[PDB]
Amino acid sequence: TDHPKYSDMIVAAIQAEKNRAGSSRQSIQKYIKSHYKVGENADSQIKLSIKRLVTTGVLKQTKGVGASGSFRLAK
DNA sequence: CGCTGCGTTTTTTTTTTCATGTGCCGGTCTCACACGTGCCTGGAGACTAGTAAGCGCTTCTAGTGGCGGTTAAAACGCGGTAGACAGCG
């Protein structure tokens, strides 16, 4: 029972939810609690992690700024 | 393997029909406005009379300046933070 790396947890959930707009923080957060396991902050962690993927170019942004909008996978 | 574009399949947006409720015209029937008539009460006349109120005069209050002094209170401005407003699901 463990929370693998920010990205190694989102990678797993965004991966099972095909969408033309993609997957958006609300959706993602609802997955992790569903099947995996966590205490809390997670949601605040998920945001910074997704911000790390925005800047670098790991996970694209569909529409919106910060942790508001839709965030897909690499290619 | 990775990309890249380019025909495909779908989505978005445009244009044209289309089925809907609108308010628009012109003929029938109803009971409500308007008239009227006749009776009765409440307004008018007029004069009486008694008292309220308005004007001037008496006083004296309580309202309007005005004079500085000290302080508490406004002013102003700078600095940052949390709350207003938009945007996403």
Ligand SMILES: [K+]
């Ligand atoms: K007075």
